[PDB]
Structure 1
Amino acid sequence: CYFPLQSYGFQPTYGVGYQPYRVVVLSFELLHAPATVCGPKKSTNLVK
């Protein structure tokens, strides 16, 4: 018998590979529902 979870060992003395690494996933879907977001639209000085 085992409990299904165990903690992760991360310490300030560890070398590369054992050290803690953060992960972010930017899950998204495209072209079904209505859109709400884009990257930036730049602009330039008001020429006349």
Structure 2
Amino acid sequence: FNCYFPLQSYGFQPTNVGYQPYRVVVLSFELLHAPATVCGPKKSTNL
């Protein structure tokens, strides 16, 4: 009805500078007190 579909298919197509779609990624880090599951690379050195 008047209150209509709030979703809409994006205006891109295999045919479709401001209208260029950009991809985005985020690594949501849960900083709560918990066991470590993701840590950085510790580049070892020669002995």
Q: Fold conserved (TM > 0.5)?
A: yes
Aligned length: 45
Gaps of 5+ in 2: none
RMSD of aligned Cα (Å): 2.4
C-alpha separation in 2, matches of 1:3 and 1:11: 21
C-alpha separation in 2, matches of 1:31 and 1:3: 39
C-alpha separation in 2, matches of 1:33 and 1:23: 27
C-alpha separation in 2, matches of 1:37 and 1:25: 15
Deviates further, 20-29 or 2-11: 2-11
TM-score scaled by structure 1?
A: 0.63
